[PDB]
């Protein structure tokens, strides 16, 4: 089997991407944030505290003939941005772009933190990291990809995120028309439960490539590119007027600037992030100070190849017995 679904930016900045997901019988379609940095599939629901729902579409298990309470199971998750959610668990039928899993754990939110409530466009998350990170207790549950894998034509999914435009998540096949050149594959460590790999270096604009190992995670659920302070300083030093602002919470730059590109290495191959991808617009409405799309990972504890990086590539998440990551230009 295979699946193919379009993923769409939630706003004009590509702050996140939503992909329609069918849950239950008859189908209830929710727009979920596919997140390769976590491993819970959770949804706004009929059980969510009413004051914490503001415009999201909810899953109502009582209206699904295939929903079953997973007795005794609870979940609770916290994300790198400080947000969180928790609740109980059902199993139900879940389909993504024509690909169907029966008995998928659907984690129903009883509580969500303010940032989720405040984002009316995201109805929940669909985790695509390794199932060892799944928070369900006392019986850990598998991700949608883990459950589908055996049935897939090939044990892979691909992320093809757009810049200010829709893109695609495919399951079970590699669309050879979706990228240019060849796909370069690179080793993955699953020891922290992430799609963790090592970039071979970087360049700023038309500058020379610096060969240096940068361990990080491929994370579709993180908006920006978080890299070591040395790398980030080298980038922003090329932008007149750019500075790190403690009050804003990262590097800012004059909105009048033209940003240089940023290149990262994948083995001997190179992925180029155009400068425009690194512009996240005014820090506040009407400001001429703009927020940077490359930020320091210092104090995160891990480097994160978020959407800023991933959307410059066609990315293969290879879930073979020994997982690997592939990157191609597009």
Tell me the three state secondary structure of residue 103: strand
Q: Which domain holds residue 190?
A: 175-330
Specified resolution (Å): 1.5
Choose, from 14, 35, 88, 307, the residue flagged as catalytic. Answer: 35
Catalytic residue check, 35: yes
Which CATH number do you get for residue 186?
2.40.70.10
Tell me the three state secondary structure of residue 138: coil
CB 212: neighbour CB atoms within 10 A? 13
Q: What is the C-alpha to C-alpha distance for residues 159 and 5, in angstroms, rounded to an integer?
A: 10
Mapped to the 3 state alphabet, what secondary structure does 213-282 carry? EEEEEECCCCCCEEECHHHHHHHHCCCCCCEEECCCCEEEEECCCCCCCEEEEECCEEEEECHHHHEEEE
Same domain, 139 and 261: no
Instruction: Give 147's DSSP letter.
Output: H
Report how many domains make up the chain.
2
Same domain, 170 and 73: yes
Same domain, 147 and 194: no
Looking only at the bridges linking them, the beta strands covering 289-292 and 279-282 are antiparallel
Indicate the residue among 174, 200, 232 that finishes a domain: 174
Query: Which residues does the chain break after (C to N > 2.5 Å)?
Result: none
Choose, from 39, 199, 261, 297, the residue flagged as catalytic. Answer: 199
Angle ∠(302,305,306) on CA atoms, nearest 5? 110
């Amino acid at each position: 089997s295979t699946g193919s679904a379009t993923t769409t930016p939630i706003d004009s900045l590509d702050d996140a991407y939503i992909t329609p997901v069918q849950i239950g019988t008859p189908a209830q379609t929710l727009n979920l944030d596919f997140d390769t940095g976590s491993s819970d599939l959770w949804v706004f629901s009929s059980e969510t505290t009413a004051s914490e729902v503001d415009g999201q579409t909810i899953y109502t298990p009582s209206k699904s003939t295939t929903a079953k309470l997973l007795s005794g199971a609870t979940w609770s998750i916290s994300y790198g941005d400080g947000s969180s959610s928790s609740g109980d668990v059902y199993t139900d039928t879940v389909s993504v772009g024509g690909l169907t899993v029966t008995g998928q754990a659907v984690e129903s939110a009883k509580k969500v933190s303010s940032s989720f409530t405040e984002d009316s466009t995201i109805d929940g998350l669909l985790g695509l990291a390794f199932s060892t990170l799944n928070t369900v207790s006392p019986t850990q549950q598998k991700t949608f990809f883990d459950n589908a894998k055996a049935s897939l034509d090939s044990p892979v999914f691909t992320a093809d995120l757009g810049y200010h435009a829709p893109g695609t998540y495919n399951f079970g096949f590699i669309d050879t028309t979706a990228y240019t050149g060849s796909i370069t594959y690179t080793a993955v460590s699953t020891k922290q439960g992430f799609w963790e790999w090592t970039s071979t270096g970087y360049a700023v604009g038309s500058g020379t490539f610096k060969s240096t190992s940068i361990d990080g995670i491929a994370d579709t659920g993180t908006t920006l590119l978080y890299l070591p302070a040395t790398v980030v300083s080298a980038y922003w030093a090329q932008v007149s007027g750019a500075k790190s602002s403690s009050s804003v919470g990262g590097y800012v730059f004059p909105c009048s600037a033209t940003l240089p590109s940023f290149t990262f290495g994948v083995g001997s191959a190179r992925i180029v992030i155009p400068g425009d991808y690194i512009d996240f617009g005014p820090i506040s409405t009407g400001s001429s100070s703009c927020f940077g799309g490359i930020q320091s990972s210092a104090g995160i504890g891990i480097n994160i190849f978020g959407d800023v990086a991933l959307k410059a590539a066609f990315v293969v998440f290879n879930g073979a017995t020994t997982p690997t990551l592939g990157f191609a230009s597009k």
